[PDB]
Design a binder for these strands. Structure first.
Ligand code: NA
Length: 91
DNA sequence: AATAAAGGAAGTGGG
DNA sequence: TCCCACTTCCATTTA
C-alpha cells in the first residue's frame, strides 16, 4: 500500500487535485494545502487506503507529523505548508 | 465566543 | 513476537 508522502508527491506530480494542494517552491520540495479544499484530498487518501472511518485533514496531518523525526516531510513555519526531503524528491 | 491551524496513547494492518 | 506505517481518539495551545 502506498505511503502517505508518496500519495502527496504523486498528486503534486499529476496535478489531479490542484485546488487542494500545490507546490510553493518545487525545487525545495515545499508544498501547501488549500484551507478550503484540503478535506476533499484527505477524503481521497482514506478511500485509497480503505480505512474504516472517513479520513479528515486533522488525522492526515497527525500522520504527517510522524515524518518529522525520520525526515520525509517536515512542517514549514507557514500556513498549511510542508517540505519533502531531498531523498523523497529524488526517489 | 466562533473558527482554524498546530502530541500522547491506544488500535489496526501486514508483515 | 513485535515492528511497520499509519489511524483513531482525545485533549491542549495559539492566533
Ligand atoms: Na485545520
Amino acid at each position: 500500500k502506498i505511503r502517505l508522502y508518496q500519495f502527496l508527491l504523486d498528486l503534486l506530480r499529476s496535478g489531479d487535485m490542484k485546488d487542494s494542494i500545490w507546490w510553493v517552491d518545487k525545487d525545495k520540495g515545499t508544498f501547501q494545502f488549500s484551507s478550503k479544499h484540503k478535506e476533499a484530498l484527505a477524503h481521497r487518501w482514506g478511500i485509497q487506503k480503505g480505512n474504516r472511518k472517513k479520513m479528515t485533514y486533522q488525522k492526515m496531518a497527525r500522520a504527517l507529523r510522524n515524518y518529522g523525526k525520520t525526515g520525509e516531510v517536515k512542517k514549514v513555519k507557514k500556513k498549511l505548508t510542508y517540505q519533502f526531503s531531498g531523498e523523497v524528491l529524488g526517489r
